[PDB]
Design a protein around this ligand. Structure first.
Ligand SMILES: O=C(NCC1CCN(c2ccccn2)CC1)N1CCCC1
Ligand SMILES: O=C(NCC1CCN(c2ccccn2)CC1)N1CCCC1
Ligand SMILES: O=C(NCC1CCN(c2ccccn2)CC1)N1CCCC1
Ligand SMILES: O=C(NCC1CCN(c2ccccn2)CC1)N1CCCC1
Lengths: 193, 193
């Protein structure tokens, strides 16, 4: 029961490694999960709902990890504290590249996918802007741009740059260099006069 | 002749203001240009080729503007020199928002669209990295990250952040604030130790 659901999600994630959602049928997902077509419909209304569930699981994983770090500050310097947050994405989405690719292709057409990602980005941009505000109040950062506008651009940069790196787009920063590249831009733009 | 072609392109750009390419038919484009369906096919093979032509015109406009500025340096400070380049996009794509929205939705599915944009981004990232290298050789900037990796992330940031601002995505930096936000991040990350 919870078994068949997990097998349907595992099948979709496996299949999305080789082709887009448009080339996967409900019959392919059911066949991979060892169930019939109408049994599939008991668990999901459509192959699009399977993708949404996979995206919801990955986004909550990242969010829970970031909550853990926000509750458990590392005894390290400021550059390494920003690095630890960025690395959540690097590690969580970078462990589910096919799902990430499929979430981005769906965003153009799917209101549900676009809304799910927006809700989460609003949260992480708010947390970012709150940290920057805290750092300015402590005298560690200068009051330059509005913190919430700076946080919005830096989080958008990381969304698009990690995507390109994970995809091997041309142009992209190589995946083994992208964390240091992003952390440089965050620390200079937040602490730089 | 050149007339009917320009009317077909003007029709598509007008229609794309109200709906996506998927909801526009060849018959809608021909009807708007005052021609029949088979006459349309004399000028374009498909509605997708009309979109590609509109994107090619906008991308070349921006590229020609950037070439003009690269040949004609402004007597101003360094922050304003980066601002003038960024503002090419702000102004050129921001004057053709519907075409820009449609180019981005097509990118997921269209190899031609994705390749056209890549060629141009490779050029502008190379120019950026060349400027940063020049500035380091003159002692104006510190040698921190590899210039070509820094240039790649900053140009990707501007692609995604200008897109969001032009679209009124939630989250996005407001269009009246996005140039100052981007120029801050470029100047601190390029000149900041
Ligand atoms: O890399 C990020 N965001 C990084 C920020 C960094 C600051 N944040 C932290 C930092 C340390 C701990 C918890 N959150 C929120 C996430 N993104 C957001 C969209 C996809 C890529
Ligand atoms: O491209 C993104 N983020 C945006 C897309 C948006 C569509 N996707 C969604 C949407 C809602 C929930 C989870 N993923 C995949 C991620 N990233 C995050 C880190 C790696 C590159
Ligand atoms: O805003 C930029 N890029 C800005 C750079 C800035 C440096 N460049 C300049 C600067 C002054 C003159 C000519 N080119 C190339 C463009 N992008 C590239 C993708 C879409 C948005
Ligand atoms: O989103 C983009 N750039 C990427 C898209 C890629 C798809 N589009 C193309 C593709 C090839 C040529 C021109 N436009 C629209 C622009 N921008 C540029 C400045 C404003 C926001």
């Amino acid at each position: 029961g919870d078994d068949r659901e997990l097998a349907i999600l595992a099948t979709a994630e496996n299949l999305l490694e080789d082709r887009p959602l448009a080339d996967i049928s409900v019959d392919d997902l059911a066949k991979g999960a060892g169930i019939s077509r109408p049994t599939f419909y008991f668990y999901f209304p459509s192959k699009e709902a399977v993708l949404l569930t996979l995206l919801d699981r990955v986004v909550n994983q990242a969010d829970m990890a970031l909550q853990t770090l926000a509750e458990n500050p590392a005894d390290t310097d400021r550059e390494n504290m920003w690095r630890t947050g960025i690395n959540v994405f690097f590690e969580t989405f970078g462990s589910h590249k096919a799902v990430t690719r499929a979430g981005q292709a769906a965003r153009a057409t799917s209101v549900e996918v676009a809304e799910l990602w927006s809700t989460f980005m609003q949260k992480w941009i708010a947390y970012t802007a709150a940290v920057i505000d805290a750092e300015r109040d402590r005298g560690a950062a200068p009051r330059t741009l509005p913190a919430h506008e700076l946080a919005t651009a830096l989080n958008l940069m990381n969304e698009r740059t990690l995507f390109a790196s994970f995809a091997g787009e041309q142009p992209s920063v190589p995946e083994a260099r992208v964390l240091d590249t992003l952390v440089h831009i965050w620390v200079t733009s937040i602490y730089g006069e």
